[PDB]
Amino acid sequence: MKQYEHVTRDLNPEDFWEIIGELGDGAFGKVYKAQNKETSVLAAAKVIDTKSEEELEDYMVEIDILASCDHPNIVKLLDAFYYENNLWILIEFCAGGAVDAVMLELERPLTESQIQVVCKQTLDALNYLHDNKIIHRDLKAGNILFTLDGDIKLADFGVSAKNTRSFIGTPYWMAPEVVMCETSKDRPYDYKADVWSLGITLIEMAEIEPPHHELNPMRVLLKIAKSEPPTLAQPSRWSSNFKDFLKKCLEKNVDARWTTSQLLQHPFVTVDSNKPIRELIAEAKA
Ligand SMILES: COc1ccccc1C1=C(Nc2nc3ccccc3s2)C(=O)NC1=O
């Protein structure tokens, strides 16, 4: 009975959106390519089997995050429906596809000039999220999408979190940070997990695969905990700016690891043209 701001109930999503293809699979099942029947707008459509009202509430976090964000490098919510025990999420379509799929299709990594554009725009998106106390929690090249104009959008907020999400009592003993709602979850610490993932994603774009890709996943967790942070395999092929930006992300001491606000001041992401990505997608169309 709970009325959700952005979710229609009891209407058939396919009366409005026509499935015209498949975009891939994932933890939440198959993701379709859909087309609005009236406007012809394209969309990625998540279709999530949800049996109970409790499951619906859990999946709603992604919808409320997408609905609340308004940033050019973050995919927008187009529609959402709950119908025949499925939650449909209609999300802005990016026709350039995911960055990891591009590297696999071309069988080569991105160049540094291309990485620099992706890094700047992804950082812009991450900084907006952190400013709004959102943690993406699944950053990787597979969750960065190319537009046909040569920009990127950050996608798949399926495990993202609003990190800060009745009587008061006598207040005389409350700490100032309690009164001011500056809890540990309001501080930079937790959001910096995304900064680490950015650094791994940069190596992934530089080398097609992330560090430790050859290891069993359980062994990868041990390596992450125990090893020094990863570096580029062929460091002499890459600029000191790129390697330095990575060092500020791939820093195991969380307090020393840079915030997105600090990274935005770094010379690696002083760049004002997306032309390397326009070139990447222009040759791919040939
Ligand atoms: C990375 O993007 C998403 C991940 C999960 C759910 C939706 C998306 C997504 C698009 N692309 C693709 N989806 C999928 C889904 C599975 C596998 C590959 C792909 S590539 C898109 O254009 N707009 C979107 O929100």
SS (H, E, C) 219-278: HHHHHHHHCCCCCCCCHHHCCHHHHHHHHHHCCCCCCCCCCHHHHCCCHHHCCCCCHHHH
CATH number of 275's domain: 1.10.510.10
Are 6 and 41 part of one and the same domain? yes
CATH number of 50's domain: 3.30.200.20
Q: Long-range pairs for 249-256 at CB < 8 Å and ≥24 separation?
A: 249/195, 249/196, 249/198, 249/199, 249/202, 250/196, 250/199, 250/200, 251/196, 252/228, 254/189, 254/192, 255/189
Cα 190 from Cα 176, distance rounded (Å) = 21
Inter-residue contact 114 to 126 (CB < 8 Å)? no
> SS3 for 56-89, per residue?
HHHHHHHHHHHHHCCCCCECCEEEEEEECCEEEE
Give the three-state DSSP class for 152: strand
Closest CA to 157 of 241, 229, 257, 60: 60
Inter-CA distances, 6 with 114, 128, 153, 271, Å: 36, 21, 21, 36
Cα 219 from Cα 193, distance rounded (Å) = 20
Place of tokens 């071309």: 106
Residue 30's domain spans which residues?
A: 1-93
Are 70 and 124 part of one and the same domain? no
Cα 217 from Cα 132, distance rounded (Å) = 32
Question: Which of 93, 120, 142 is the C-terminal boundary of a domain?
Answer: 93
Domain count, the chain: 2
Cα 240 from Cα 243, distance rounded (Å) = 5
Question: Which of 43, 68, 93 is the C-terminal boundary of a domain?
Answer: 93
Are 49 and 164 part of one and the same domain? no
Tokens representing 280 are 């990447």
Closest CA to 242 of 152, 111, 99: 111
Are 39 and 149 part of one and the same domain? no
Are 182 and 123 part of one and the same domain? yes
Instruction: Tell me, using a 6 A CB cutoff, whether residue 205 lines ligand 1.
Output: no
Are 258 and 160 part of one and the same domain? yes
Closest CA to 285 of 35, 95, 109: 95
Are 70 and 208 part of one and the same domain? no
**C-alpha Rg value of the chain to the nearest Å:** 21
Inter-CA distances, 144 with 2, 102, 128, 182, Å: 33, 11, 15, 31
- Which of 22, 31, 35, 118 best tests ligand 1's pocket when mutated (most atoms within 8 Å of CB)? 31
Strand partners, 44: 33, 91
Question: Which of 68, 93, 118 is the C-terminal boundary of a domain?
Answer: 93
Are 78 and 213 part of one and the same domain? no
Q: For the chain, how many residues are written? A: 286
Phi-psi region of 28 (alpha: psi -120 to 50; beta: other; left: phi over 0): alpha
Are 114 and 6 part of one and the same domain? no
Q: For residue 177, what is the DSSP state?
A: H
Per-residue buried b or exposed e for 202-213, using 16+ beta carbons within 10 Å of the residue's own CB: bbbbbbbebbbe
Are 65 and 192 part of one and the same domain? no
Place of tokens 């992706």: 118
Cα 197 from Cα 86, distance rounded (Å) = 31
Return the active site residues: 138
Inter-residue contact 247 to 203 (CB < 8 Å)? no
Atom of ligand 1 nearest to the CA of 92: 23
Are 120 and 35 part of one and the same domain? no
**Counts for the chain of helices (H) and strands (E), in that order:** 9, 11
Strand partners, 92: 43
Instruction: Tell me, using a 6 A CB cutoff, whether residue 29 lines ligand 1.
Output: no
**Method by which this entry was solved:** X-ray
Closest CA to 125 of 144, 146, 112: 144
Are 142 and 188 part of one and the same domain? yes
